[PDB]
């Protein structure tokens, strides 16, 4: 239910939650995505840029 707002729209853009996490968890500062990422079901129009961060390395 929580992690749906980190796949339900991202899978289309290709950003599939567990294969995007072997990407995320290369950074030793980001680990606690498991619940707190729930902000995505209403922060949408500004959450939509958090993928751009490192896209030319992370992608």
């Amino acid at each position: 239910l929580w992690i749906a707002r980190i796949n339900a729209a991202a899978r289309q853009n290709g950003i599939s939650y567990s294969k995007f996490i072997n990407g995320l968890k290369k950074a030793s500062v980001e680990i606690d995505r498991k619940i707190l990422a729930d902000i995505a079901v209403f922060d949408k129009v500004a959450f939509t840029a958090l993928v751009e961060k490192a896209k030319a390395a992370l992608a």
Binding site: L1, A4, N7, V41
Partner: protein, 140 residues
């Protein structure tokens, strides 16, 4: 200060015209259930009490691809264990949308719990742009 989603009855029913009919069917008939619970609408109540409405289009083109389709019997024997028996195979039965080869939910909510009242909500007609027996507000 609760995180769960009661009731919800029903918020998200996704009025999608299942162009998947035949062409890739055995890849998404297996997922009609995980649709009516999830993979997009998983955002709400991804296990309990909800409702759903895809927009059906055809029936007898189940596709299914393999030696199965021409000796796999369907049985029911609905009375006193039936006695005398029934054996018409999956492409020869699929010639009618009926009770076991058309719904997929019969295979996927299999005891009846979660499924116990919203049985016909998908319409269970078939017939394309000759007969749209479904929704009048704009489908998808």
């Amino acid at each position: 200060m609760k995180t769960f989603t009661a009731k919800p009855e029903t918020v998200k029913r996704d009025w999608y015209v299942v162009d998947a009919t035949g062409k890739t069917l055995g890849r998404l008939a297996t997922e009609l259930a995980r649709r009516l619970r999830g993979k997009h609408k998983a955002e709400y109540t991804p296990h309990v009490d909800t409702g759903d409405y895809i927009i059906v289009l055809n029936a007898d083109k189940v596709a299914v691809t393999g030696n199965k389709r021409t000796d796999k019997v369907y049985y029911h024997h609905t009375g006193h264990i039936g006695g005398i028996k029934q054996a018409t195979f999956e492409e020869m039965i699929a010639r009618r949308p009926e009770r076991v080869i058309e719904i997929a939910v019969k295979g996927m909510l299999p005891k009846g719990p979660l499924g116990r009242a919203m049985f016909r909500k998908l319409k269970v007609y078939a017939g394309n742009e000759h007969n749209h027996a479904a929704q009048q507000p704009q489908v998808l």
